[PDB]
Amino acid sequence: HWGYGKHNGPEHWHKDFPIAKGERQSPVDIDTHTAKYDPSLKPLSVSYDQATSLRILNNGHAFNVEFDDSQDKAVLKGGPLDGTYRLIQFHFHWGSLDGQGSEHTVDKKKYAAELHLVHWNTKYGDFGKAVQQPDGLAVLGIFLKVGSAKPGLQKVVDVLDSIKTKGKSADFTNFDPRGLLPESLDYWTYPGSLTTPPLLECVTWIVLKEPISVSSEQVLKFRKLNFNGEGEPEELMVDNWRPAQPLKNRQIKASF
Ligand SMILES: NS(=O)(=O)c1ccc(C(=O)N2CCC(c3ccccc3)CC2)cc1
Ligand SMILES: [Zn+2]
């Protein structure tokens, strides 16, 4: 199946998932000078005070911190969105080196990693039905640069030992996602897709202008994870990012 290796990586995905060459694929390069300020964009509304994390999972491509999305406990609204989107999970994409790792790029600049807080439009009933809709998902992207440590991320870093290989999971309750946010909520927004197969074009991307900083130690831990399952040859989980795709007939809007 698909992955990020030289033989099953992004350049191969189109064979099993032809939408890979679609009209609204993600990620994309964010040309800051070409993005247009849209004064009609409402302020983003992040309501995570009632968030309920349940567990963390190594799925073989990245690791997901899942939340209870059976109720409106942690929602995203406002901004370019119409309606209420529930947070279902967040994960990251990172590189083998600090100079790479993010999926989106800013004026071609690559960050060491990128956080994706995934939400689905409640009007669609569940995540599965939502990914089948043009406005089914809202993914909040947050760039990570290496510098000072991000205190709110350490709980995540310290649990990675428990889910080193594909398929492992561990309880991860009472984790507060608000600790992963930058001070500013200024953002860029554009219509796109999931950045991994099936690459469905069901995402409204909201990428924050301000990156958060994490320490070299924190990111190093990410790089000790495995793509493989226990008892299989060790393949470090690194560079699990898709490169920038053609913007085509789309325009990136800025909230600032
Ligand atoms: N990187 S990202 O764009 O943020 C992103 C976000 C979420 C997922 C994700 O969970 N998968 C697995 C489940 C699959 C699916 C679920 C239900 C019905 C059909 C398909 C969609 C993709 C992948 C990439
Ligand atoms: Zn992602």
Ramachandran class of 209: left when φ > 0, alpha when ψ lies in -120 to 50, beta otherwise: alpha
User: Which residue shows structure tokens 């990428």?
Assistant: 207
Atom 14 in ligand 1: which residue has the minimum CA distance?
198
Is 52 annotated as belonging to a binding site? no
Looking at domain 1-256, which CATH architecture does it have?
Answer: Roll (3.10)
Cα gap 230→90, rounded to integer Å:
23
Sequence letter at residue 70: S
Q: Which two tokens stand for residue 204?
A: 């409204």
Q: Decide: 156 and 117 in contact? Cβ < 8 Å.
A: no
User: What is the 3-class SS of the chain, one letter each residue?
Assistant: CCCCCCCCCCCCHHHCCHHHHCCCCCCCEECCCCCEECCCCCCEEEECCCCCEEEEEECCCCEEEEECCCCCCCEEEECCCCCCEEEEEEEEEECCCCCCCCCCEECCECCCEEEEEEEEEHHHCCHHHHCCCCCCEEEEEEEEEECCCCHHHHHHHHHHHHHCCCCCEEECCCCCHHHHCCCCCCEEEEEECCCCCCCCCCEEEEEECCCEEECHHHHHHHCCCECCCCCCCCCECCCCCCCCCCCCCCCCEECC
Which residues contact ligand 1 via a Cβ below 6 A?
116, 118, 127-128, 131, 139, 194-196, 198
In 10 A of CB 155, how many CB atoms?
16
Rounded Cα distance, 60 and 111, in Å: 22
Q: Which ligand is nearest to the CA of 92?
A: 2
Q: Beta strand 36-37 with 53-58: parallel, antiparallel or unpaired?
A: unpaired
248 in the Ramachandran plot: left (φ > 0), alpha (ψ -120 to 50) or beta?
A: left
Structure tokens at 199: 């690459």
Distance 202 CA to ligand 1 centre (A): 10
- The answer to whether 173 is a known ligand-binding residue is no
Q: Which of 156, 137, 149 is nearest to 195 (CA)?
A: 137
Catalytic residue among 14, 61, 104, 119: 61
91 annotated among ligand-binding-site residues? yes
Half-sphere exposure of 6 (CA within 13 A, CB side): 0
Centre of ligand 2 to C-alpha 2, Å, is: 15
How far is residue 76's CA from residue 36's CA, in Å, rounded to a whole number? 23
Number of Cβ within 10 Å of residue 124's Cβ equals 19
Burial 47-78 (b: 16+ CB within 10 A, else e): bbeebbbbbbbbebbbbbbbbbbeeebbbbbb
Distance of CA 8 to the CA centre of its chain: 21
Tokens of 45: 């509304």
How far is it, in rounded angstroms, from Cα 133 to Cα 114?
A: 24
Buried b (16+ CB within 10 A) or exposed e, 214-245: bbeebbebbeebbbbeeeeeeeebbbbbbebb
User: CA 70, CA 210: separation in Å to the nearest integer?
Assistant: 30
Experimentally, the structure was elucidated by X-ray
Residue 27 alpha carbon to ligand 2 centre in Å = 9
One-letter identity of residue 29: D
Q: Is 61 a catalytic residue?
A: yes
CA distances in angstroms from 39 to 30, 80, 106, 253, listed in the order given? 19, 11, 21, 10
User: What is the rounded distance in angstroms from the CA atom of residue 201 to the CA atom of residue 7?
Assistant: 24
Per the structure block, which two tokens stand in for 203? Answer: 């995402």
Ligand 2 midpoint to CA 194 (Å): 7
Instruction: Identify the nearest ligand to the CA of 197 by its number.
Output: 1
Atom of ligand 1 nearest to the CA of 200: 21
Q: What type of residue sits at position 74?
A: A
